[PDB]
RNA sequence: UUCAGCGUUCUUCGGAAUGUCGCGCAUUGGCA
């Protein structure tokens, strides 16, 4: 039983809008603020969004059982990797995807050029009936942002580690094509998992060939 | 608690007194577009103020607030209605006391007062 | 474009900003920085400053260049470009034509759309009009604005004008036949109500005598500037009363002081060819 | 589950204006600036703008049901291609059009030509009752610049992928005939499409025919 | 931005004070019309503001923190144009000498910084806007 | 006749988000 870290980075290729809540909108300010970790007041990519997007894309690639009403009905590879909660037959998740924080490198390259971390994109909604717009402000994340994604893989069945990492590779390739966060259908969310560093944090497992 | 009192209740009552009905006309005929432009400038400075975490206003935001006062004067010169609104709500005087205090809190209550002015101006229409 | 047409770009350049060869009869439009650095290198910058201090009113660049006797090829290196000129008087003023980022000559489609909207009135989302095709800069020649109010007079306003479009409609809202008929009707109204007043004035008699108006002048539009108050805006007499009232309200000096209604409100171009020309008139053609 | 990636060129036929607020403007300068990528500080055709324009044009082309007060109720082909949100009938979005960034080719062309990618256009409103003009300055994108637009289509219903890509091509043609961005009824927003390459990045679908 | 004589600083409130100082009611024929800078109107002011506008746009598009040589020559041409316009009309001459703009352009040239040029542009904004306000 | 331009506007008006989900399940409970 070993624990392997996949710490790397995420290069946003367009705006990234992972919305939030709990703050009332000052009149004329951002209507849909981006989620920020309150202590640093920086936009972040919650690990829940990453894990959900990876799981959804991988399930679509592998195939969904027709009439699937719950997440626990996915293919056994998906349940083995991302976790399942059935009645009595519960499978632990070997993937633990943490919140990806704003990188210090991107923070420095944005402090240079005097560039704000987020971009208040200005949008509208032309109705189909009266053809009247409706202003909206969305707090996207700028293109230069890099996020320190941190994933832990737990090796439980040593025989399935290779196939599980092939699944992870397929899912991250699907994510390189698919977006992260909301509004991805309208230009947001594009990313690329360019930077990686995989090694065995705990145990004796071989992490050189992964 | 800016100056003299100046609060959100002051905003609601001043919009009430300056409201006159013939159609509804406020501050001797101030359209909502001019107020929205002023609030847009307020938002532009307020976003930078909010993003910074320190409690003391920086030099950049202070210069932007002086610019905001100049823009207020320009808008008053452009249209008499905006001039009467600025004089009846004393917004530029609040900008001055915000500059004098050099505190983020005073700017935040100033922005709250401006937003209250906008909200009550739209509500009474 | 039967008459010289100038679409301003918001930049007005003075006499001292550009060179004017009177004998060669051509205007060298020059950029500032190239001339400034040329004079700094050649020691003519202090001379230019002393020239400006000596004569405040008239500071023609060409006369200064002749006084310093600088090389003509040394003139060409700081000159942005050259244009053929037409003057009735060195030139006083100059209005530049509209140039996009690339720098080609073009009339914006917004001017055409606004003129069409004004003439047709008497919404407008269906008529989508785009910019006209690029034109080579050689057609850009400098003309003069001349006021004809019972007597011709040259004016200091010199203007860069063109030498004498893709559009889509929706069938229900607009029709080509209807819009062209309305254009022709508006032109006929302009001729009947206001052009006759200028025909009757002695300055108008001089204008027609020289063949200033085109013989043909169908579809005629007032695209650019300098066309007049009869365009850019009713019974004939009531219309004249409204124009006189608005001019009294706006222009306190020329119209406010004088109380009597003029013969025609408002009371009011030379080219090297003997034919006279008028500013802004254009002939259009529409193809489906 | 294959993702088919469209990459192509959007070359500006005329000046392009796509407004965006939140920028302090100097007196007499550009009153309504164009949208900018904050990082590159260059004009950009947002993916939202392209997607909204294409959907609007396509839905107008096939037809609009009377009293259409919402975007969810529409021609079902548009719902399949671009998405839907109707209660109990959510349809996933098969087209994810992203931001069109300023290409290096056109940027270097302008750099060699000593041209700025934007331009300031002078206009004025002539009230005709008094013939009184009120001037304004609109930012436009210099003609000849090029953007690289990058769409991704998820192949969910294999049977109708040909019809869906035909609809995409028709929408692209509709965007050809019309403008994009600000007031194009007065001459802005003209664009041109050059389809660079269509391929299947992830999966085993055949992209030769498309 | 810079410093004038008698220890007075250059700022936007200084522009307000300058425009106020050169304001005379100057009633004529029983009508109260405001004159600024001894006969200066707003048309000359808008012309000067447009002259500033061109260079401001050029510097605002560029990302460089140091003033380019092209913008330096822009500013030299600006100095020449200011001198010419001041020589043309006495009212513009009084305006230029009272607002010390001709010295300010020299200061921004010496500083060779985009931020300083932006501050000078803001100062000229204050001048024109405050002249519009007091009128 | 000569010379010279001059003033006017510098953006305006609206739209400032909307609709929907508002935790669910499993165990604890109730029944048996």
> Which pair of tokens denotes residue E119?
């501050």
Looking from the CA of A161 toward its CB, the CA atoms found within 13 Å total 17
Supply the DSSP symbol for A24.
P
Closest nucleotide to residue E92 (Cα to C1')? Answer: F6
Q: Name the 3-class secondary structure at B93.
A: helix
Question: How remote is the C-alpha of B70 from its chain's centroid?
Answer: 13
Closest CA–CA distance from residue D3 to any residue of chain A (Å): 7
Q: Give the nearest partner residue to C36 out of E47, E54, E77, using CB atoms.
A: E77
> Which pair of tokens denotes residue D130?
């008094």
Residue A77: name the closest of A89, A64, A99, A62 by CA: A62
The chains in contact with chain C, meaning 3 or more Cβ pairs closer than 8 Å, are D, E
Strands lying side by side in the sheet with A8-12: A101-102, A146-148, A8-12, A191-196
Say if residue C66 is exposed, middle or buried (CB neighbours under 10 Å; 0-12, 13-18, 19+): exposed
Q: What are the two backbone dihedrals, phi and then psi, of residue E13, each rounded to the nearest 5 degrees?
A: -65, -30
Strand partners, A97: A151
Question: How remote is the C-alpha of C274 from its chain's centroid?
Answer: 19
Using the structure block, give the residue that is written with the tokens 């931020």: E115
Sign of CA dihedral C34, C35, C39, C45: negative
Between CA B92 and CA B50 the distance in angstroms is 21
Question: How remote is the C-alpha of E132 from its chain's centroid?
Answer: 13
Question: How remote is the C-alpha of E47 from its chain's centroid?
Answer: 11
Closest CA–CA distance from residue D75 to any residue of chain C (Å): 22
Q: Do the Cβ atoms of D119 and C127 come within 8 Å?
A: no
> Which pair of tokens denotes residue C25?
């009869």
Size of the C and D interface in Cβ pairs below 8 Å: 83
Q: Give the nearest partner residue to D22 out of B44, B64, B67, using CB atoms.
A: B44
- Does the CB of C154 fall within 7 Å of any strand F atom? yes
Long-range contacts of B93-97 (CB under 8 A, 24+ apart): B93/B3, B94/B2, B94/B3, B94/B6, B95/B65, B95/B68, B95/B69, B96/B69, B97/B2, B97/B3
Residues of B in contact with D19 (CB under 8 A): none
Question: How remote is the C-alpha of B11 from its chain's centroid?
Answer: 10
Strand partners, D102: D147
Give the distance, in angstroms, between residue E123 CA and nucleotide F2 C1'.
Answer: 42
- Does the CB of A28 fall within 7 Å of any strand F atom? yes
Between CA D83 and CA C192 the distance in angstroms is 59
- Is residue E121 within 8 Å of residue E101, measured between CB atoms? no
> Which pair of tokens denotes residue C281?
């008139």
Kind and range of the H or E run holding D37: strand D36-37
Strand partners, A73: none
Rg (CA), chain A: 19
Residue D180: name the closest of D57, D32, D23 by CA: D57
Question: How remote is the C-alpha of C223 from its chain's centroid?
Answer: 10
Q: Does B92 touch chain A (CB under 8 A)?
A: no
Using the structure block, give the residue that is written with the tokens 């769409």: D151
Looking from the CA of A70 toward its CB, the CA atoms found within 13 Å total 8
Specify whether the backbone of C247 is left (phi greater than 0), alpha (psi in -120 to 50) or beta.
alpha
Contacts (Cβ under 8 Å, ≥6 apart) of B5: none
Q: Do the Cβ atoms of B67 and D24 come within 8 Å?
A: yes
- Is residue C12 within 8 Å of residue C94, measured between CB atoms? yes
- Exposure string of D123-136, with b = 16+ CB inside 10 Å and e = fewer, is beeeeeeebeeeee
Contacts (Cβ under 8 Å, ≥6 apart) of C238: none
Strand partners, A85: A90
Between CA D102 and CA D122 the distance in angstroms is 24
> Which pair of tokens denotes residue B92?
């530029």
- Is residue E64 within 8 Å of residue E12, measured between CB atoms? no
Residue D15: name the closest of D147, D186, D142 by CA: D142
Q: Name the 3-class secondary structure at A54.
A: helix
Between CA B61 and CA B111 the distance in angstroms is 14
Between CA D12 and CA D100 the distance in angstroms is 12
Residue A90: name the closest of A101, A102, A82 by CA: A82
- Is residue D7 within 8 Å of residue D190, measured between CB atoms? no
DSSP letters, B38-91, are: HHHHHHHHHHHHHH---SS--HHHHHHHHHHHHHHHHHHHH-HHHHHHHHHHTH
Residue D121: name the closest of D106, D143, D136, D103 by CA: D136
Supply the DSSP symbol for D63.
-
Looking from the CA of C19 toward its CB, the CA atoms found within 13 Å total 25
> Which pair of tokens denotes residue B78?
């452009």
Say if residue D141 is exposed, middle or buried (CB neighbours under 10 Å; 0-12, 13-18, 19+): buried
Contacts (Cβ under 8 Å, ≥6 apart) of A131: none
Supply the DSSP symbol for D167.
H
Q: Name the 3-class secondary structure at A35.
A: coil
Q: What are the two backbone dihedrals, phi and then psi, of residue D209, each rounded to the nearest 5 degrees?
A: -65, -45
Q: Give the nearest partner residue to B40 out of A26, A28, A117, using CB atoms.
A: A28
Strands lying side by side in the sheet with C140-148: C8-14, C93-97, C152-162, C140-148
Closest nucleotide to residue E42 (Cα to C1')? Answer: F7
| Minimum-distance residue to F26 (CA–C1') | A87
Strand partners, C129: C167
Residue C18: name the closest of C34, C4, C6, C7 by CA: C34
Strands (E), A25-150: 36-37, 42-43, 84-85, 90-91, 95-97, 101-102, 118-123, 136-141, 146-148
The chains in contact with chain D, meaning 3 or more Cβ pairs closer than 8 Å, are A, B, C, E
Size of the C and E interface in Cβ pairs below 8 Å: 36
Q: How far is CA D88 from CA A131, B28, C271, D84, D91, in A?
A: 26, 51, 74, 10, 9
For strand F, the positions having any atom within 7 A of a protein Cβ are 3-20, 24-26
Say if residue A16 is exposed, middle or buried (CB neighbours under 10 Å; 0-12, 13-18, 19+): buried
Contacts (Cβ under 8 Å, ≥6 apart) of E57: D29, D30, D120
Strand partners, B24: B21
Closest CA–CA distance from residue B91 to any residue of chain E (Å): 16
The C-alpha angle C233, C235, C238, rounded to 5 degrees, equals 80
Q: Name the 3-class secondary structure at D171.
A: helix
- Is residue C190 within 8 Å of residue C230, measured between CB atoms? yes
Closest nucleotide to residue A70 (Cα to C1')? Answer: F25
Q: List the alpha helices (DSSP H) in chain D.
A: 47-62, 76-82, 104-113, 161-177
Kind and range of the H or E run holding D133: strand D132-141
- Is residue D28 within 8 Å of residue E50, measured between CB atoms? yes
Strand partners, D177: none
> Which pair of tokens denotes residue C184?
């022709």
**Start-to-end C-alpha separation, chain A:** 16
Q: Do the Cβ atoms of D46 and A121 come within 8 Å?
A: yes
Between CA D178 and CA D53 the distance in angstroms is 9
Residue D147: name the closest of D196, D188, D185 by CA: D196
Question: How remote is the C-alpha of D56 from its chain's centroid?
Answer: 11
3-state secondary structure chain C: CCCCECCEEEEEEECCCCEEECCCCEEEEECHHHHHHHHHHHCHHHHHHHHHHHCCCCCCHHHHHHHHCCCHHHHHCCEEEEEEECCCCCCCEEEEECECCCCCECCCHHHHHHHHHHHHCCCCCCCEECCCCCECHHHEEEEEEEEECCCEEEEEEEEEEECCCCEECCCCCCCHHHHHHHHHHHHHHHHHHHHHHHHHCHHHHHHHHCCCCCCCCCCEEECCCCCCCCCCCCCHHHHHHHHHHHHHHHCHHHHHCCCCCCCCCCCCCCCCCCCCCCCCEEECCCCC
Contacts (Cβ under 8 Å, ≥6 apart) of D206: D200
Kind and range of the H or E run holding A10: strand A8-12
Q: How far is CA A44 from CA A16, A21, A49, A118, C11, in A?
A: 10, 14, 10, 11, 47
Between CA C36 and CA E77 the distance in angstroms is 7
Between CA D21 and CA A123 the distance in angstroms is 10
- Is residue D46 within 8 Å of residue D98, measured between CB atoms? no
Rg (CA), chain C: 22
Between CA C94 and CA C141 the distance in angstroms is 11
Between CA C160 and CA C94 the distance in angstroms is 7
Structural biology method used: cryo-EM
Question: Taking the CB of residue D176, how many other CB atoms lie within 10 A of it?
Answer: 14
Q: Give the nearest partner residue to C56 out of E47, E73, E88, using CB atoms.
A: E88
3-state secondary structure A126-193: CCCCCCCCCCEEEEEECCCCEEECCEEEEECCHHHHHHHHHHHHHHHHHHHHCCCCECHHHCCCCEEE
Contacts (Cβ under 8 Å, ≥6 apart) of E130: B70, B73, B74, E15, E16, E19
Between CA D59 and CA A131 the distance in angstroms is 13
Question: How remote is the C-alpha of D54 from its chain's centroid?
Answer: 7
> Which pair of tokens denotes residue E10?
């250059």
> Which pair of tokens denotes residue C259?
């109380």
Q: What is the resolution of this structure in A?
A: 2.9
Give the distance, in angstroms, between residue A85 CA and nucleotide F31 C1'.
Answer: 25
| Minimum-distance residue to F18 (CA–C1') | A134
Give the distance, in angstroms, between residue D43 CA and nucleotide F22 C1'.
Answer: 40
- Does the CB of A132 fall within 7 Å of any strand F atom? yes
Residue C266: cis peptide before it, omega within 30 degrees of 0: yes
- Exposure string of C145-154, with b = 16+ CB inside 10 Å and e = fewer, is bbebbeebee
Helix pair angle (A161-177, A47-62), 10° resolution: 100
Residues of C in contact with E48 (CB under 8 A): none
Q: Name the 3-class secondary structure at A18.
A: coil
């Amino acid at each position: 039983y070993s624990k392997i870290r996949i710490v790397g980075k995420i290069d946003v290729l367009t705006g990234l809008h992972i919305g939030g809540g709990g703050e009332t909108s000052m009149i004329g300010a951002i209507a849909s603020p981006v989620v920020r970790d309150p202590y640093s007041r920086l936009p972040i990519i919650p690990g829940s969004s990453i894990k959900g997007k990876m799981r959804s894309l991988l399930a679509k690639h592998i195939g969904l059982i027709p009439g699937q009403k719950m997440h626990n009905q996915d293919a056994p590879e998906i349940l083995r990797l991302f976790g399942s909660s059935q009645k009595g037959a519960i499978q632990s998740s070997r993937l633990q995807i943490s919140d990806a924080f704003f990188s210090k490198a991107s923070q420095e390259e944005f402090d240079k050029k005097d560039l704000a971390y987020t971009e208040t994109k200005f949008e509208n909604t032309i109705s189909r009936l009266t053809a009247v717009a409706n202003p909206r402000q969305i707090e996207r994340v700028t293109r230069g942002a890099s996020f320190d994604f941190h994933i832990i893989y737990n090796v439980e069945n040593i025989n399935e580690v290779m196939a599980d990492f092939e699944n992870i590779k397929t899912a991250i390739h699907l994510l390189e094509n698919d977006y992260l966060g909301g509004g991805g259908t309208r230009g947001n969310g594009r990313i690329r998992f360019v930077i990686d560093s995989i090694d065995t944090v705990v145990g004796d497992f071989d992490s050189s060939n992964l | 608690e800016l100056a003299k009192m100046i609060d959100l209740n002051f905003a609601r009552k001043v919009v009430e007194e300056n409201k006159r009905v013939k159609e509804i006309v406020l501050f001797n005929g101030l359209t909502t577009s001019k107020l929205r432009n002023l609030l847009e400038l307020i938002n532009h400075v307020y976003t930078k103020v909010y993003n910074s975490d320190d409690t003391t206003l920086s030099e950049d935001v202070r210069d932007e607030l002086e610019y905001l006062k100049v823009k207020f004067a320009y808008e008053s010169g452009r249209e008499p209605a905006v001039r009467t609104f600025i004089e009846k709500t004393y917004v530029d005087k609040l900008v001055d006391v915000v500059l004098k205090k050099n505190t983020k809190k005073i700017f935040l209550d100033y922005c709250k007062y401006f937003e209250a002015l906008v909200a009550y101006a739209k509500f009474y229409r | 474009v039967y008459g010289p047409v100038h679409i301003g770009s918001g930049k007005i350049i003075r006499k001292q900003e550009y060179i004017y060869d009177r004998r060669k009869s051509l205007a060298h439009i020059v950029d500032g920085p190239n001339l400034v650095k040329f004079l700094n290198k050649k020691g003519k910058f202090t001379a230019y400053l002393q020239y400006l201090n000596t004569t405040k009113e008239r500071a023609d660049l060409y006369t200064f260049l002749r006084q310093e006797q600088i090389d003509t090829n040394d003139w060409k290196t700081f000159v942005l470009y050259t244009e053929r000129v037409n003057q009735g008087k060195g030139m006083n003023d100059l209005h530049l034509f509209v140039r996009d980022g690339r720098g080609d000559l073009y009339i914006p489609g917004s001017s055409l759309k606004g003129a069409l909207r004004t003439v047709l009135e008497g919404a407008f989302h269906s008529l989508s009009i785009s910019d006209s095709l690029p034109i080579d800069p050689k057609n850009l020649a400098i003309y003069q604005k001349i006021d004809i109010n019972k007597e011709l007079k040259p004016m200091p306003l010199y203007r860069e004008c063109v030498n004498v479009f893709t559009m889509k409609i929706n069938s229900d809202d607009w029709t080509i036949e209807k819009i062209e008929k309305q254009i022709q009707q508006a032109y006929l109204q302009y001729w009947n109500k206001w052009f006759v007043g200028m025909v009757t004035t002695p300055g108008g008699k001089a204008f027609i005598k020289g063949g200033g108006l085109p013989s043909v002048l169908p579809t005629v539009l007032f695209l650019g500037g300098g066309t007049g108050f009869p365009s850019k805006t009713k019974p004939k007499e009531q219309a004249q009363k409204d124009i006189f009232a608005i001019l009294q309200r706006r222009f306190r000096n020329v119209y406010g002081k004088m109380a009597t209604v003029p013969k025609n409100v408002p009371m009011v171009v030379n080219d090297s060819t003997n034919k006279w020309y008028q500013q802004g008139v254009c002939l259009l053609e529409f193809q489906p």
